[PDB]
Design a protein around this ligand. Structure first.
Ligand SMILES: OC[C@H]1O[C@H](O[C@H]2[C@H](O)[C@@H](O)[C@@H](O)O[C@@H]2CO)[C@H](O)[C@@H](O)[C@@H]1O
Length: 390
């Protein structure tokens, strides 16, 4: 087989606590002799389905739940078999996130949402509104700093602002998402993206800023604010910055609405190690000690495991995560999410760079948002012979 029998290969995004996860893997190996190798490939959410479609890849894939319906529909995921006693250990909300066509398709790990992160020494009183950011930036620029830097390459980070005044992905009614009813080019979405583009045109932000650039600037103390998730807190702890984590600014008086993700672990349908993967996930990772090892590396957010309590008091950063999560919406897990995200990525990048107007960018994204992975689609070469055209 392509996937090696008798070991586990696990893929997780490079922003998460892969070192802590590897520690859990080493404990599994110490107890059972089964080697666990953790990797963090680039473009994971795309690499996984490409390799899994050919029966290759990791035994276990970690990503937010929104990608998993597409993976399931394409036959890339094993059926998971947690018993009732195991299911009882995790919050019902988190199982809901990984339920697709009635089946649980992955193990939920933790709830993630973006928050506003700010430097208390530069900015003891962070802005309550998006609208006050230009004036704040002007003052900071005179002091050799800037107001705000965050990743402008992934639409996840701009979505909270696009959604604030009325943008939405897929309409949800009567227990169903309507894939023909998209909210990407409505008045609310246009208002939010226009605000973002104005920030860039007015030199308060730079369209080229990505995750690494924003993190480096915030953690060096060059910018007063950033927008990020729980995984980012570890590096800020290491930094010299005295930081707060708080509610995102409002726009037109309405809350920013981050899309809430549940980090989840799926088992590759091609894996010959499905029972090993179940043992590892249920009995090693989704335990107080397992989650602690990952969380101590990079924070997970609000974990799915009911029993977990490694602190004496609440973590105010988690409280802020939850406040933002409650203001936002849970991502759909439907297969159409990949098309939505590709479309909105294009719109934000093109509007931010000036390649298109906001109206044109969102018009296209609306059209483009409204099975995914099979060998004969995902293979990089041709599958028919040239002779066929004769
Ligand atoms: O930007 C589109 C992207 O958004 C989400 O990905 C997040 C992920 O959920 C977070 O955990 C964070 O760590 O990384 C990503 C942002 O760069 C969706 O989950 C993903 O499918 C989508 O492509």
């Amino acid at each position: 087989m392509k996937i090696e029998e008798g070991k586990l290969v696990i893929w997780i995004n490079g922003d998460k606590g892969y070192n802590g996860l590897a520690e859990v893997g080493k404990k599994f190996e110490k107890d059972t002799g089964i080697k666990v190798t953790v990797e963090h490939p680039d473009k994971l959410e795309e690499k996984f389905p490409q390799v899994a479609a050919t029966g290759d890849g990791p035994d276990i894939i970690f990503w937010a739940h929104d990608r998993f319906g597409g993976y399931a529909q394409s036959g890339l995921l094993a059926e998971i078999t947690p018993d009732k006693a195991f299911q009882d250990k995790l919050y019902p909300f988190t199982w809901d996130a990984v339920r697709y066509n009635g089946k649980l398709i992955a193990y939920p790990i933790a709830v993630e949402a973006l928050s506003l992160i700010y430097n208390k020494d530069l900015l003891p009183n962070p802005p309550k509104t998006w609208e006050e950011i230009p004036a704040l930036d002007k003052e900071l620029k005179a002091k050799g700093k800037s107001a705000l830097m965050f990743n402008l390459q992934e639409p996840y980070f701009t979505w909270p602002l696009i959604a604030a005044d009325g943008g939405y992905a897929f309409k949800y009614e009567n227990g169903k998402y309507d894939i023909k009813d998209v909210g990407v080019d409505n008045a609310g979405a246009k208002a939010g993206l226009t605000f973002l583009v104005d920030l860039i045109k007015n030199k308060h932000m730079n369209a080229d800023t990505d995750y690494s650039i924003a993190e480096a600037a915030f953690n060096k103390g060059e910018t007063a604010m950033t927008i990020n998730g729980p995984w980012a807190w570890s590096n800020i702890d290491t930094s010299k910055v005295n930081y707060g984590v708080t509610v995102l600014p409002t726009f037109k008086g309405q809350p920013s609405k981050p899309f809430v993700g549940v980090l989840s672990a799926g088992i590759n349908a091609a894996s010959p190690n499905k029972e090993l993967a179940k043992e590892f996930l249920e009995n090693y990772l989704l335990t107080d000690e397992g989650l602690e090892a990952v969380n101590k590396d990079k924070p997970l957010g609000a974990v799915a495991l009911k029993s977990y309590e490694e602190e004496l008091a609440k973590d105010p950063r988690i409280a802020a995560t939850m406040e933002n999560a409650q203001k936002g919406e849970i991502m759909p897990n439907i297969p159409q999410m990949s098309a939505f995200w590709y479309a909105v990525r294009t719109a934000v990048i093109n509007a931010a760079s000036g390649r298109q107007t906001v109206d044109e960018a969102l018009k296209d994204a609306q059209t483009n948002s409204s099975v995914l992975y099979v060998g004969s689609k995902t293979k990089e070469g041709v599958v028919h012979g040239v002779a066929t055209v004769a």
